[PDB]
Amino acid sequence: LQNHELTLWNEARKLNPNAIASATVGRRASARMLGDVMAVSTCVPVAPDNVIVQNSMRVSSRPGTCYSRPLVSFRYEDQGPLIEGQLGENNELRLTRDALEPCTVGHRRYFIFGGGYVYFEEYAYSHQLSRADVTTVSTFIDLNITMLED
Amino acid sequence: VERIKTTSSIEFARLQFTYNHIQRHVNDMLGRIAVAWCELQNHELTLWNEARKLNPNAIASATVGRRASARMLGDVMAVSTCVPVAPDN
Amino acid sequence: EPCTVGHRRYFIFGGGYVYFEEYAYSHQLSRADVTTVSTFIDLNITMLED
Amino acid sequence: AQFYVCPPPTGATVVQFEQP
């Protein structure tokens, strides 16, 4: 099974190296492909109290094109300077706010934030919500094991 | 001051050991399988988070249990049930 | 592809890898030369003793 | 041997995968 499963993984690392490497190595790391292998680097932990979310995903300087992912301000330490950035995939912080797409009518988006989600409507913040608020379908195949009674 | 009476058949004890031995082993092995199963899914999920980005339709249809349309809406996808159509139409 | 600064790349070659720097050959290397992370979920099943 | 047809989904119905 594993020998078979690997064939998917060699593809998955192409699709999203960060998640694949993070799951495979055992630590939250950032990776990038360098041909037939990925380079990794440990990511710095950040407390959730030191991160604030900027409101509007619009861009005042370039109309029609606007951010695809929420913008945040984070500080490494409680007394550290406030540094701009944008939220990423599975709670990762991007220094460059380069996630720009043409603005679309009917913009309703959910983003992973902390232990829950943040919901935006028309490139504007709408509200936060907890994980339990969204129904869950299981990707796991259940297997119930009971031991022999002594 | 009493005299101890001894049963004439040790077999029960042997049975116990036998029933212990087998049991212990399986209660080990199956348990390992359980863990081995668990991590698998926990590991497998990392593939799925990519697959849903490729075509949310098939992924949602397989995971939910009904043929549904899906569209990726940020970090989560929205689904909608799909109506049947006869093959002659 | 357009040539990119800081071009350091590994390529599968024979039974090992070949490493290039700045779109130029650097050197060959064996499989053991690169650390390995395992995608295999270990399952140690051992047999009953007779 | 039967077909399925359906429009794009709406934001009303949202579903997430289970965490480990």
d(CA B47, CA B30): 26
Which chain D residue lies closest to B89 (C-alpha atoms)?
Answer: D3
Residue of D11, D15, D19 with shortest CB distance to A135: D15
Neighbours of C17 (CB within 10 A): 20
d(CA A122, CA A105): 7
d(CA B79, CA A118): 19
Residues 1-20, chain D, touching B (beta carbon < 8 A): 1-17, 20
Helix-strand-coil percent breakdown of chain B, rounded to 5? 60, 15, 25
Segments of chain A assigned E as strands: 29-33, 38-42, 51-53, 65-67, 71-74, 83-87, 93-94, 100-102, 108-113, 116-121, 125-129, 135-137
A69 φ, ψ to 5°? -135, 145
Binary contact (B45, D20; C-beta < 8 A): yes
The set of long-range contacts for B31-34, using a CB threshold of 8 Å and a minimum separation of 24, is B31/A145, B31/A147, B32/C43, B32/C44, B32/C45, B33/A145, B33/C43, B33/C45, B34/A143, B34/A145
3-state secondary structure of B25: helix
> What is the C-alpha radius of gyration for chain B, rounded to an integer number of angstroms?
28
- b/e burial code for range A55-90 (CB count within 10 A of at least 16 → b): eebbeeeeeeebbbbbbbebbeeeeeeeeebbbbee
Angstrom CA distances, B57 to A134, B48, B79, stand at 19, 13, 8
- Looking only at the bridges linking them, the beta strands covering B77-81 and B68-72 are antiparallel
Element of type H or E holding B49 = helix B11-54
Determined by: cryo-EM
